[model samples]
Target: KFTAQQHVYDINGVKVGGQPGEYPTVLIGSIFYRGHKIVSDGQKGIFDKDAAKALLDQEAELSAETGNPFIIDVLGESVEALTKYVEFILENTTAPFLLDSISPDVRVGALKNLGKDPEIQKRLIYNSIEEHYTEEELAAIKEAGLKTAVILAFSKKALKPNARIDLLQGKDDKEGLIAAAKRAGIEQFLVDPGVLDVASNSWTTEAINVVKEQFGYPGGCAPSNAVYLWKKMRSKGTPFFEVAGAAVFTYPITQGADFILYGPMMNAPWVYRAIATTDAMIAYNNKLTGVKMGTTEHPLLKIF
Candidate 1:
């Protein structure tokens, strides 16, 4: 999965920048939407690496009212574009950077840049990481001297129903991702148990539980799967508990998830019928008692 040169570079490089970004760790909301919205799915999902950092700059400034910074995710299809996402963020907001990249060139470039900049070196929520670790990105993480979140499913083999749970539950399977994080020396890493259409209840329940309990690492699952409950509700009118259930599960059942990456529970066709319902669900989850971090305010929630 790597070259020796990349390994050495990722671990050590001249400290150039002051701090890559800042921290407290804010629970970012709606920032992945910062860049141009085009593609959705794959690692690129609805964002343009080329446009992100600048868009993040604007979004972060507008979104952080509680003084919480944004966890910017860079979505791109190639090396240069992903790297540009970081560059754009570096030039804009003062918030600590979350290098949501999957490019070796981008990761390496970020570290190399930080090594050169006096200001951006010291603060970093996360620095660089590719889908797994490639020679070049590893080199950059080393060049900049940082660690970051890794996909929990050992970088995910594929979304096939059986394969996902197999990886999640396979032989200390959860540890595969944890070990990778520990090896990388990252304080935080995420376990992505893969999203489902909800009909696959058995698989969803099993995989999600493994990701939360066995892994102990921060976890993420789309709140959208809650959408399935709607179909399951299949009552004459749009069932409301389907919405309530999504919010309520945010705690009891999903207590394992470190952060809930909200999906389509808030938009278009779903909204016409469930605007009030979605608002209430968001509020409940945002304030769930034992939840790790406090609720993240949405841009649309602003009283303005």
Candidate 2:
């Protein structure tokens, strides 16, 4: 068998977050967030299409170089803007991408927009479905026919492992976010153990391990989010800051992260190399332990 009881899900034909060490961790690079260079107009939804494609092109080049596949983190100011941005992203790249927005309505709108385009629907992943959800929003996501999702195992009660798992698997079948996602027809799950600060960051990593062992869902954390919020790293600046960033980004793999929301798009090149190194080591170790990494050649085997 591959490894333990893990479940790997395919987006279109690309796979993400499988059994430990069996596959390269998926790297998701953010496309449009705050202060992005290519994003010119937030309200009217205009941007340097050429520059944006160039950035993603660089990401693809790195993905190929490092033997990893990547997803685009598409964020937008409004539904209108997000619709346009999603269209542009889909038109340009064949790689699967996420529909990300803090605003629930915007996410629903993005889902609806994608639902309208059946050609690209199979490649779409709803960026996330967390603790809070409205009926309308859930309905929209289900109607969009999106099977893949990122579920946040976050708990406001306490930053404890069991508490987050409770939210993930629930008491019975009617309780947690996992149940809700199931009810909404989500077939494939990528659990984000939630990321905060250094102290809580450690908790997130532990949570990833616990969830993977207990549920075997492909799970990970955005460790760079912790680095971004840390005051000392911000004050340090440049290469040093990026050094810290690289460390955090790769830390999750040690704890069994199958994918990562690896910060801004600019970090794509270096980040891919870091992930590839970790993947190669993990793959070798897994193979040594008599674990098979599916039928396809992993980045470790393909690249090296």
Candidate 3:
């Protein structure tokens, strides 16, 4: 079990407050299964309202067992609907609720309408922002005055430079994205260098190291992307899929991330097990000390 003794308090499963000096790993939950996709996605265990209540109960009840903050993601199509879901979580647990995959409009509108609503404020984390939006929308969020997630995905041409210039491309979309965030007074944001899909495209190994140390933005990788790699190759590939997962997911623990946003596994009910495995991988990375023996034992070119 991990001792949270570093934080001075003994509140098991509580998030250690992260200031400039305090480094804490935030465990955000993907707990809210979508209304349409919930049951089919292994939420069958939480059958009805009461059953769902019990499920949240288990999440709250098992916090100490997990030994980290037990945060939950609220899934819904819009702000109002998601707000209700957040309300549901509030009633069920003392843990904070994360706003997952909500629309920019909803994000802005919610804050515009009730950002300061004590209920929402006490437990809200907006995340999983993958695409950029109009300045109008960004401005609305700024005006609304809320903490937000700023993903570093760029316009179509963004990746080309990185690809062409190679390691010379320290020039990422990070500065512009951070600038947008700065304008909005959004200090805490996430920058994904995009995930590696071995089946699809791969990033230069050097790009990752550069982004990690220099950018200084908290980072994350959607676990499902790694799972795609795992699914495609199976045992043909190295166990490094899990290692990569650990490397990227623990960016926060290394002070390279503020929180980890994990998406659902591809196959749902079957994928839940895989999702659990992925979550465990993230947790292992969080708790891990340094690189272990047998980690990519080859020389630079072969391994990198």
Candidate 4:
């Protein structure tokens, strides 16, 4: 329904972006995050491989059942752990994975170590090119030969939708993250309108729509972050928190998000089913406009 020219990129086999009906809303689930139950040691990247595999297997199963493509967001606390995590992920699943870590060195180290493999490089998506990126990090990404990334449009000074877009477009003198991404040789990337908390939800949601409408880049947000930060809801009860969390996760797709980083990999079951149902409804609505579903495996057909 966006008039702006939309851009779609094929990351590995998953097609992201285009119009609402063009593709299923891609779901990204975070794994090995800090305090994740499966990770025995965050610094060492020690985890129960069997437990990790089981989670991925469940994700794969839900992806197949609902027709929504999935990506694994891998988070590492240390370089040593990141390297092992990347290796384990590559050995276990064919799904394209994101390289993420709080420490820049951990991310940079992983890229430097695995950037040379032709097979791995193609399936690896750098978790982000943010408002501020160091030369070393950009060089490592370029050196790794990564072609896809997530560009985060987050600004402490600017929380408005247009202000966030400015971060991507670059105002007067500043260069935008998009240009920086291109400079780093990232051929394809998703624009994430960062979510700070419940109060910022409106800004983040509107930004997703505006970004797609203006730039046609695949736009999405980590809405679960808002839910997680909702102290009042958490204080209420588990029942209230669970329902609110589900709503927050599914809310972005309704506004035109191409993907949802739905927090934990453990939430895949309900999250995938919920998003697939929404995707089917969106596709059905677009059908009246003669927008054909792009994939035969689309939820419009598979979920019905």
Ranking of predictions according to TM-score: 4, 2, 3, 1
User: For residues 1-304, what per-residue lDDT tens digits would candidate 3 score against the true structure?
Assistant: 1222121211223333322123333455455455434443322123245655765666544333333344565565565555556556667677665565445665565456455555553455555344465676567555645454535443444454243222222255443555555666554554444544532223422333334444433433444445444654445455554444444444333432334444432222222223233334533453355422121211111211
Worst window of 10 by summed lDDT in candidate 3: 295-304
The digit string of per-residue lDDT tens for model 1 on 1-304 reads: 1111111111121111010010111233223332335334333333445454445445444334323223444444444444555565556655454554434454555456456344444345342332355545444454554554535452335554345434533444233433444455554454455444454333443554454443343444444445535654535344564454344333323223333333321232222223223333333454444322223343223322
Model 2: residues >4 Å from true position, as ranges?
1-4, 172-174, 295-299, 302-304
Query: Which candidate would rank higher by TM-score, 1 or 2?
Result: 2
C-alpha lDDT values of all predictions: 0.39, 0.78, 0.43, 0.86
Model 1 lowest lDDT segment of ten: 14-23
lDDT for model 1, on a 0 to 1 scale?
A: 0.39
Order of quality (lDDT): 4, 2, 3, 1
Candidate 3 structure, TM-score to reference: 0.56
Better candidate by lDDT, 3 or 4: 4
Candidate 2 vs 3: which has more lDDT: 2
Worst 10-residue lDDT window for candidate 2 reads: 113-122
Residue-wise lDDT of candidate 2 within 167-196, one digit each (tens)?
876765437887888777888888987887
Assess the local accuracy of residue 120 in candidate 4 as a C-alpha lDDT between 0 and 100. 70
- Number of the predicted model whose lDDT against the real structure is largest: 4
Off by over 4 Å in 3: 1-25, 32-52, 118-122, 128-131, 148-175, 196-209, 225-259, 264-304
RMSD of each: 10.9, 2.2, 9.9, 1.5
